[PDB]
Write a protein that binds this DNA or RNA. Structure first.
Ligand SMILES: [Mg+2]
Ligand SMILES: [Mg+2]
Ligand SMILES: [Mg+2]
Ligand SMILES: [Mg+2]
Ligand SMILES: [Mg+2]
Ligand SMILES: [Mg+2]
Ligand SMILES: [Mg+2]
Ligand SMILES: [Mg+2]
Ligand SMILES: [Mg+2]
Ligand SMILES: [Mg+2]
Ligand SMILES: [Mg+2]
Ligand SMILES: [Mg+2]
Ligand SMILES: [Mg+2]
Ligand SMILES: [Mg+2]
Ligand SMILES: [Mg+2]
Ligand SMILES: [Mg+2]
Ligand SMILES: [Mg+2]
Ligand SMILES: [Mg+2]
Ligand SMILES: [Mg+2]
Ligand SMILES: [Mg+2]
Ligand SMILES: [Mg+2]
Ligand SMILES: [Mg+2]
Ligand SMILES: [Mg+2]
Ligand SMILES: [Mg+2]
Ligand SMILES: [Mg+2]
Ligand SMILES: [Mg+2]
Ligand SMILES: [Mg+2]
Ligand SMILES: [Mg+2]
Ligand SMILES: [Mg+2]
Ligand SMILES: [Mg+2]
Ligand SMILES: [Mg+2]
Ligand SMILES: [Mg+2]
Ligand SMILES: [Mg+2]
Ligand SMILES: [Mg+2]
Ligand SMILES: [Mg+2]
Ligand SMILES: [Mg+2]
Ligand SMILES: [Mg+2]
Ligand SMILES: [Mg+2]
Ligand SMILES: [Mg+2]
Ligand SMILES: [Mg+2]
Ligand SMILES: [Mg+2]
Ligand SMILES: [Mg+2]
Ligand SMILES: [Mg+2]
Ligand SMILES: [Mg+2]
Ligand SMILES: [Mg+2]
Ligand SMILES: [Mg+2]
Ligand SMILES: [Mg+2]
Ligand SMILES: [Mg+2]
Ligand SMILES: [Mg+2]
Lengths: 91, 50, 77, 63, 247, 112
RNA sequence: AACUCUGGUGGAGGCUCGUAGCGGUUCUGACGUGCAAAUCGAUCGUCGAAUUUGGGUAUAGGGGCGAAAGACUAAUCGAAC
RNA sequence: AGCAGUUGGACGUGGGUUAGUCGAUCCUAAGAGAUGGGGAAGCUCCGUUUCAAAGGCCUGAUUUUAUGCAGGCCACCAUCGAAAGGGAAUCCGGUUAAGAUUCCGGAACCUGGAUAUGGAUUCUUCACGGUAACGUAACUGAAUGUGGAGACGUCGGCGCGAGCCCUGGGAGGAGUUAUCUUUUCUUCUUAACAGCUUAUCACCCCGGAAUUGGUUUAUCCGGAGAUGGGGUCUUAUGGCUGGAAGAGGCCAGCACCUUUGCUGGCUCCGGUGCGCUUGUGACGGCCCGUGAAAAUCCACAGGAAGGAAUAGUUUUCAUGCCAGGUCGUACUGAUAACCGCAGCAGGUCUCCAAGGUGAACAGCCUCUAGUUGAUAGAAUAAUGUAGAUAAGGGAAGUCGGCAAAAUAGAUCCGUAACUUCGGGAUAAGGAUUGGCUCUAAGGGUCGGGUACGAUCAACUUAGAACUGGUACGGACAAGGGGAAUC
């Protein structure tokens, strides 16, 4: 069933810590515990391995990433910027 | 301590061989003044402090 | 302790120039379906291991206990 | 004698209980017994041919 | 009358780092002929977790140019590098994420990390997690490169100082609340003994400049001179302004 | 129940002081000091435990014969038959792509 | 239609009740020329972690160390012996 | 020895501690610390690889050799630091007044060294089989490099094993026997080491999957090759055998200052499980925590070098031969062997851990083992200290419900305000509970034509009748609650 209405993963914290703080940690404990898809084998088997490490259980390949997501928005912007500058330099 | 060093066991051996009373013939000597063993040690009275 | 399942290997083992003593141990055992019989263990004392040959037939036991070398000291029981 | 009485079912009423139901026998243990019974029966039936794999796979998840 | 707690940290008795579990000093490869004239290919073999550090470390194995062996370097992993990735380090390296190439041989607006202050000191700037240095300038007549540091500071580095393309991995770490002193305890247990912090106003006057009184107050001004001496500097040292950052 | 004692002067439940209660031919329960369990040799590429090689404590490999410590294939007790297969396939294919790259580069530098 | 609901499963938490353990609330109980230069009894707080602890090691006196009481630094602490 | 004492941890005199395998020794941890060098009037301080001319390993295996009058290689740079961490290897039985993993007997193993025989390999000189995972008794391999082991958190449930517990049959011995009881208690054991077998996981070969299938307690896996059919492996672990019944155990009969023993029998076959303790396996959860190091040992890559007659070399195969030093080793580990002035209700780290009740390593009772020690006797005044009870009232007592009492386990019902929506909550509040005789559900293994039965077993749940001085969480154990304020 629906065990909890809105705390979700932060029902382990009970009534403590403050509701805003438990919301802020809920939105990142979902993110750091989600299974992500691998960019090398296509399977949704990427898990976090001590923040910054994201390891795929198939094919055993490990990517550096953000502390709670595989790809932060700053890093994706950096990847696009370096792609743009490399395409400008080598052409 | 049942796992001693030889230095501790050497001092323990000296203490064992010293843990004796006065010889009785020493009290019969000419101009004897020694009455008893005044450096006598027991394990229940004074710890020898290694 | 090692067990031999071979007769010729045992017999060349008794003449190894390190073996001085053997033992013939007689067990009063039971087979399957419980009939009493006479197991015989021949134990050769090598210099590193003791080798046991287990013979469940008294005819073969009598044959090998006579085929043992005469210079080798055999204990019984 | 008390063990034979307990096997016959005596000395197990409401006032002979000091631990909870889940303390006396866990609901997880009861569930594990049930699920292994149903999976054993389903695998026995599928390998005996009295159900096919397409009925077995429905009944596996429904069990 | 007593030596105070910030003064006691320089003797370094209990205030040393807790460096048992750390993988090594995360440094760039040493500046040799290969890195100075061409490039050298290494291989990422592990992305490991450093203890007391918020960012992962890439154990990148190169070949030693002069002796047949393998030289393992410990880089700070930029966000996007993976195991089995070839890392190309040197002047003739290409502009890919993870490559280690000088600030003279990159375009304007390039985003680097683990970037040096002097050419050959093996990584100094933008090494914490999520941090990066933007390359805003070049000055080829004096071999300089204007960069923007993570603090907003504009700095002029040599164009032969190196940097690793990308942002440092482990970004967004501080966005999660620690929620409890247990999480802060285990945070600082592998860094150093800088926690828990007693406030100086809770102390006695012998323990701190702020201590004492029948009410917990500071008494004198918290803004202390830069030319003040060791023992007085317990407050806001050399503060240009105070209060909230509003206008 | 008979109750056993440690046979050595270490009285603590350390990793090197594990015991096992065993019944002796005298009929009594006695502690038996078990050694540490051995770990399988792992591959140097994938880290998976590799087959055909005995699981011994590290100085027990000096006692056994050469057969127990290797497999008869290349990279015997070092790699695990799919890592070796990948190394062979990669060694063949990259050293053919090197020849292809050599003739393409020679063509492009010989055109102009 | 976005999506809701129910029954199971699962076994999280500086979660709870409570042994060992660690503390030491109240009796302002006992004792108070004591068993004891701080204990005894009941009653209590806590009990899976900011836990409890042995061994090794480091910090030494106007110095240390202090989740801060001028606390603790060998029955010695608003400056040990 | 706060009484005593013939007793003693006391007094007097002696005896006692046996190691290749248990430890130290060796390695590194946090760290201590010389050297070079720098500082300091100096005692000495810094630093631990530095800004040092810091060096030792094999020669291709050998007579112009105490192996050099030769190459070749290594770029590291003291040492101390753990009797709980890492670590080469020993077990059973017996034995003493007191020692034992140390002695004795038997059975092993490890390291170092020497070295012979058998085997193997060799006219294709440095093996062969399997498609393969890999197999084997062997089956050359220097520098150098690489890799592995050492080498690693914590919790949760599940699986397997061991020991214990429970228990059936049988072979003994002991108890009870007015009556009953095929009964109550007890013995029925198998070490290190060795051989052959033995597995989750993992891998290989065939094959090519949607009607998606396999599958866990826990939902993961499959065209990057699932299910399925064959195999390969690690040997934790189990089984059979050797050890090894000859030992040990339980008995019987005869000997009866017999030396002090002899002879004989039996020591067998099972079952069970959310059991307990422990080891372990495959997993899962957690982390801004991702949970030592080195010694040491091995393998691989490389191919320097060396070598072929009836076996030239080489043997990580087997069997043989010799050696294993030094120190510790007795005992207590505490209500008397340690610290607290002591023979002090204090403090002091840890392993093992039976039956019942019960959720329980709680409390209460017992088995093995241990103790029965603490000045005693008499009498039963007050006042105490500890434990209780009390008619009617029920906080009127007191600064204050201090102290005590009430409540309490489990099952079912019922549960408010407020809330950060997680809680509050065991809210509050209310029924039931014994015994006996039954009933009904909840399992495992055993078969089919190229619809159903034997058989075995555990304790959970629900219900019913009957029954009793309405008792029943019958001892123990075990929340008082509510409305509010700071
Ligand atoms: Mg239970
Ligand atoms: Mg449940
Ligand atoms: Mg440090
Ligand atoms: Mg503070
Ligand atoms: Mg204060
Ligand atoms: Mg052993
Ligand atoms: Mg808690
Ligand atoms: Mg609690
Ligand atoms: Mg307690
Ligand atoms: Mg304790
Ligand atoms: Mg008082
Ligand atoms: Mg008094
Ligand atoms: Mg007194
Ligand atoms: Mg001072
Ligand atoms: Mg004050
Ligand atoms: Mg004091
Ligand atoms: Mg007296
Ligand atoms: Mg007297
Ligand atoms: Mg005496
Ligand atoms: Mg040893
Ligand atoms: Mg040392
Ligand atoms: Mg050790
Ligand atoms: Mg023995
Ligand atoms: Mg003894
Ligand atoms: Mg012996
Ligand atoms: Mg031959
Ligand atoms: Mg062959
Ligand atoms: Mg042995
Ligand atoms: Mg398959
Ligand atoms: Mg335990
Ligand atoms: Mg190995
Ligand atoms: Mg050999
Ligand atoms: Mg001894
Ligand atoms: Mg002893
Ligand atoms: Mg003792
Ligand atoms: Mg004393
Ligand atoms: Mg003293
Ligand atoms: Mg006494
Ligand atoms: Mg019990
Ligand atoms: Mg029970
Ligand atoms: Mg009278
Ligand atoms: Mg009354
Ligand atoms: Mg009344
Ligand atoms: Mg009043
Ligand atoms: Mg009044
Ligand atoms: Mg009260
Ligand atoms: Mg209630
Ligand atoms: Mg309330
Ligand atoms: Mg009833």
């Amino acid at each position: 069933a629906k065990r909890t209405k809105k705390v979700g993963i932060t029902g382990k914290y009970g009534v403590r810590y403050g509701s805003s703080l438990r919301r802020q940690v809920k939105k990142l404990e979902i993110q750091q515990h989600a299974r992500y898809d691998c960019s090398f084998c296509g399977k949704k088997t990427v898990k976090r391995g001590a923040a910054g490490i994201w390891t795929c259980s198939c094919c055993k390949k490990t990517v550096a990433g953000g502390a709670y997501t595989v790809s932060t928005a700053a890093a994706a912007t950096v990847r696009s910027t370096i792609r743009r500058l490399r395409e400008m330099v080598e052409a | 301590a049942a796992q001693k060093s030889f230095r501790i066991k050497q001092k323990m051996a000296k203490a064992k061989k010293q843990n004796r009373p006065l010889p009785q013939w020493i009290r019969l000597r000419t101009n004897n003044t020694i009455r008893y063993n005044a450096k006598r040690r027991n394990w229940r009275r004074t710890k020898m402090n290694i | 302790a090692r067990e031999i399942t071979d007769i010729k290997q045992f017999l060349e083992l008794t003449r190894r120039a390190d073996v001085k003593t053997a033992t013939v141990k007689i067990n009063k055992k039971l087979n399957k379906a419980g009939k009493p019989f006479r197991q015989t263990k021949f134990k050769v004392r090598g210099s590193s291991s003791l080798y046991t040959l287990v013979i469940n037939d008294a005819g073969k036991a009598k044959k090998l206990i006579q085929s043992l070398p005469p210079t080798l000291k055999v204990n019984r029981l | 004698a008390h063990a034979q009485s307990k096997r016959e079912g005596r000395h197990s009423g409401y006032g002979k209980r000091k631990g909870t139901r889940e303390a006396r026998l866990p609901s997880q243990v009861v569930w594990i017994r049930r699920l292994r019974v149903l999976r054993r029966l389903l695998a026995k039936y599928r390998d005996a041919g009295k159900i096919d794999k397409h009925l077995y796979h429905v009944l596996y998840k429904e069990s | 009358g007593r030596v105070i707690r910030n003064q006691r940290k320089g003797a370094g008795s209990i205030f040393t780092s807790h460096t048992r579990l750390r993988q090594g000093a995360a440094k760039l490869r040493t500046l040799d002929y290969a890195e100075r004239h061409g490039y050298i290919r290494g291989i990422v073999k592990q992305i490991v977790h450093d203890s007391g550090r918020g960012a992962p470390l890439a154990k990148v194995v190169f070949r030693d140019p002069y002796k047949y062996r393998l030289r393992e370097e410990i880089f700070i992993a930029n966000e996007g590098v993976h195991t089995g990735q070839f890392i190309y380090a040197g002047k003739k390296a290409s502009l890919n994420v993870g490559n280690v190439l000088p600030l003279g041989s990159v375009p304007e607006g390039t985003i680097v990390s683990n970037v040096e202050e002097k050419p050959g000191d093996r990584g100094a700037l933008a090494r914490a997690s999520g941090n990066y240095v933007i390359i805003i300038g070049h000055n080829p007549d004096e071999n300089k490169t204007r960069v923007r540091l993570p603090s907003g500071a504009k700095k002029v580095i040599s164009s032969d100082a190196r940097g690793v393309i990308g942002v440092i991995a482990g970004g967004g770490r501080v966005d999660k609340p620690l929620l409890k002193a247990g999480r802060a305890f285990h945070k600082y247990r592998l860094k150093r003994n800088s926690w828990p912090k007693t406030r100086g106003v809770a102390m006695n006057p012998v323990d701190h400049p702020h201590g004492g009184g029948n009410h917990q107050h500071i008494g004198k001004a918290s803004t202390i001179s830069r030319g003040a001496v060791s023992g007085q500097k317990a407050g806001l040292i050399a503060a240009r302004r105070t209060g909230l950052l509003r206008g | 129940a008979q109750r056993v004692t440690f046979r050595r002067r270490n009285p603590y439940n350390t990793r090197s002081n594990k015991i096992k209660v065993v019944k002796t031919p005298g009929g009594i329960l006695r502690a038996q000091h078990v050694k540490k369990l051995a770990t399988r040799p792992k591959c140097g590429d994938c880290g998976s435990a590799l087959q055909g090689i005995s699981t011994l404590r590290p100085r027990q490999y000096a006692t056994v014969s050469k057969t127990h410590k290797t497999v008869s294939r290349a990279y015997g007790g070092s790699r695990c038959a799919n890592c070796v297969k990948e190394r062979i396939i990669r060694a063949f294919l990259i050293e053919e792509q090197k020849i292809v790259k050599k003739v393409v580069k020679e063509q492009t530098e010989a055109a102009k």
